[PDB]
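Is chloride ion placement plausible here? Inputs below.
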Amino acid sequence: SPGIWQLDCTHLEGKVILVAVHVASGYIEAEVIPAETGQETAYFLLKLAGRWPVKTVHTDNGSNFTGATVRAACDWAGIKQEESMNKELKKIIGQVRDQAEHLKTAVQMAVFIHNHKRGYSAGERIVDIIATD
Amino acid sequence: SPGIWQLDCTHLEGKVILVAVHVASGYIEAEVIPAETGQETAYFLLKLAGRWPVKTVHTDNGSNFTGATVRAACDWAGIKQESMNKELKKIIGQVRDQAEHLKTAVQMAVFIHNHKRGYSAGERIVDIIATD
Ligand SMILES: CNCc1sc(-c2ccccc2)nc1C
Ligand SMILES: CNCc1sc(-c2ccccc2)nc1C
Ligand SMILES: [Cl-]
Ligand SMILES: [Cl-]
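Reply from A.M.:
I modeled the complex. C-alpha cells:
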C-alpha cells in the first residue's frame, strides 16, 4: 500500500492545518490553509498528488469533501477516496513555537523534525517503500 | 548528486513563483509565494528541506538571500548555498483556463511535470534517493 495516505485536520491559534500521513512510513506533508473549504482542500490534495504517487486518500469525509471542486480534483489526479500524528505534530510545534513569528513557519519546522528524526526516519522509509514499489 | 537542488524565481500575472528542481532527476517543487522576500524564501526552503534530504541549494544569490532570516533557516536545516523552467510555464499555459486561480494551475503543472513519462521525474528522484 505504497500509494495510501490519510488526511486529517487540526486546529491551532484559530488557524486550520491539513496533515497528510503516508500510512506505511509515517512521513507527513502538512500546511496551514486559509479555511477548511473544498477549494482549499482540493488545492492541498493536488499539491500532494503532484509530489508523491497518491492512489487513495482516507479522509474524515466531512463537509469540505462533499463538493464539486474536491471531487473534480481527486478525479483529475486519479485519486480515490476510500493517528495522534496530530498529537505528536502539535507537540513538536509546541517545542518550536517560540522560534518563529508565524505559525506557518513553526508548522514547517515541525514537519522537518518529524520527517528527519531517526533506525530509519520517516523520510528514509517512504523513499524505500516507494522505490521498492 | 542526490542532495543537490536549484531554486529559481519566475513571474506570471504579477505574482512570484519559486521553483526548486532536484538536479539529478528533474523533479520539481514549486509554489506561488506572497512576495520575493527573505522571510518567504526562508519559508519555502524549510518546506522543501522537510520533505526531501536537501544538502545544497544553488540559488541566484539575489536580494532575498542576503538577509538574516534566510541564512538562519538554511543554518537550522543544515543546507549550504553553493531547463525545466520554461517547460513549467508552458504547461501552466496549457492548463491556465481550468482553474480560477494561478496557484491551482501551478500545482496542476507540477503534477504533470513530475508524472509525465522510461521513467518520470518522480520515479527518478525516488530511485536516486533510495540508492543513497
Ligand atoms: C532512503 N535513504 C536516503 C535518505 S531519504 C531521507 C529523507 C527523505 C525525505 C525527508 C527526510 C529525509 N534522508 C536520507 C538520508
Ligand atoms: C520509483 N518507482 C515508483 C513510482 S514513484 C512515482 C512518483 C513519485 C513522485 C511524483 C510523481 C510520481 N510514480 C511511481 C510509479
Ligand atoms: Cl479535513
Ligand atoms: Cl529567487
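Short version: The first helix of chain B runs from residue 38 to 51.
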